Amino acid sequence: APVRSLNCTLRDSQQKSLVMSGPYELKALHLQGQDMEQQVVFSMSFVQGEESNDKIPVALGLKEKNLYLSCVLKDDKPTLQLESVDPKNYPKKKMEKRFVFNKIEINNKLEFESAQFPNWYISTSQAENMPVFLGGTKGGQDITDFTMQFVS
Numbered sequence: 001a002p003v004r005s006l007n008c009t010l011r012d013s014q015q016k017s018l019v020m021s022g023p024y025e026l027k028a029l030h031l032q033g034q035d036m037e038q039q040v041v042f043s044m045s046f047v048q049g050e051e052s053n054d055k056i057p058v059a060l061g062l063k064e065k066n067l068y069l070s071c072v073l074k075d076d077k078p079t080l081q082l083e084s085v086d087p088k089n090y091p092k093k094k095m096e097k098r099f100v101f102n103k104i105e106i107n108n109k110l111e112f113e114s115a116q117f118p119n120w121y122i123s124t125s126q127a128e129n130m131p132v133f134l135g136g137t138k139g140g141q142d143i144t145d146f147t148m149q150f151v152s
């Protein structure tokens with residue numbers, strides 16, 4: 001059958017919202033009130049991959065747009081990019097590995113590990129208005145934990 005998807009927003013554990021930073025980047029900033037319309041709505045697809053009770057493979061497409069978060073090497077480093085796809089073929093259940101995140105639920109928070117690059121995580125900075133990026137430790141000063149909000 002089709003692939004199943006949910007509309008959602010994400011906030012980092014310091015409660016920073018995610019917005020577009022030009023066409024192929026997201027940034028994280030503190031948002032409240034009218035400006036909350038500026039947040040990206042993810043279509044989170046539940047995709048093929050290794051799965052356990054608390055580790056669920058997803059793709060983070062942007063709702064209504066043929067864009068996906070993806071993990072690739074850039075100048076020899078695992079990086080997070082927004083990648084365009086053929087809108088006729090996406091979403092699909094068997095998403096390519098660069099698009100897959102393991103959504104991990106620990107202590108009422110979510111982490112998104114790259115399926116492609118083990119122990120690399122969707123990350124934000126503590127500073128306002130900095131890129132969302134792929135970071136190589138769920139440790140340290142950078143933020144690797146999120147909450148999801150469901151959208152109609």
Ligand SMILES: CC(=O)NCCc1ccc(S(N)(=O)=O)cc1
Pocket residue numbers: 007039040041042062063064065151152
């Ligand atoms: C049903 C509902 O609340 N839709 C939100 C509208 C909507 C908001 C944001 C985006 S995006 N992916 O471009 O950031 C798409 C649609």
